């Protein structure tokens, strides 16, 4: 419902930019525009909420991934989700740029939250002996950030996947 509105926000802001038709987001989410407005009264609030929700969905996937997969495989799956997040962030670049230029702070403590999710994955994989234990999570984060910077476009997805494979291979015991 909320997740539906904010998923729709990512899509519509990515396609239409800052000037997106808000009624389109409501309708795609199967919701009235009064409902959209009661929850997200300004377009900047909606943009920021959509960004924050991408961040939270990425971070909050970790316990479930660790529950279902061996920890190095959990880390690998999560790195794909990190690129999905990067591709989303890039998709709504014009919208996020506008919120910042108008005085907003969509980002807040997102970098720390994402770093901590990575630390949780890497501590579990290192404890299991599935990865080396001497790599810092802050350096892995920088590696993923660079792959985001070079390879976040939808058309760069194969290169992004191969670069993720290379960095994950750098973690091998």
What is the per-residue binding string for its own copies in 65-94, x denoting contact by CB under 8 A? -xx---------------------------
95 binds its own copies (CB under 8 A): no
Among 19, 68, 105, 139, contact with its own copies (rule: CB under 8 A): 105
Among positions 115-154, residues that touch its own copies (CB under 8 A) are 115-116, 119-120, 123
122 vs 2, 134, 161, 173, CA distance in Å? 31, 10, 19, 13
Closest separation in Å from C-beta 44 to its own copies: 8
Distance CA 160, CA 154 (A): 10
Among 11, 27, 52, 157, contact with its own copies (rule: CB under 8 A): 52
**Nearer residue to its own copies within complex by CB, 112 or 154:** 112
**Ordered alpha helix ranges (H), the chain:** 2-16, 22-28, 33-39, 43-59, 62-68, 71-91, 93-101, 110-127, 137-151, 157-169
Among positions 37-96, residues that touch Cl ion (CB under 5 A) are 52
Give the containing element (helix H, strand E) for 153.
Answer: none
């Amino acid at each position: 419902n909320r997740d539906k509105i904010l998923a729709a926000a990512v899509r519509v802001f990515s396609e239409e930019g800052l000037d997106a038709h808000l009624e389109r987001i409501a309708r795609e989410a199967g919701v009235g525009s009064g409902t959209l407005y009661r929850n997200f009264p300004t377009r900047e609030a909606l943009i920021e909420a959509a960004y924050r929700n991408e961040v939270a969905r990425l971070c909050d996937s970790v316990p479930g991934l660790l529950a279902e997969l061996p920890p190095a495989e959990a880390l690998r799956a999560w790195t794909r989700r990190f690129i999905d997040y990067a591709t989303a962030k890039l998709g709504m670049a014009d919208a996020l740029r506008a919120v910042v230029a108008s005085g907003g702070d969509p980002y807040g403590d997102s970098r720390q939250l994402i770093q901590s999710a990575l630390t949780a994955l890497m501590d579990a994989a290192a404890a299991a002996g599935e990865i080396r234990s001497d790599i810092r999570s802050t350096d892995m984060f920088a590696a993923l950030a660079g792959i985001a910077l070079t390879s976040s476009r939808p058309d760069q997805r194969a290169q992004a996947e191969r670069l993720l494979d290379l960095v994950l291979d750098g973690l091998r015991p």
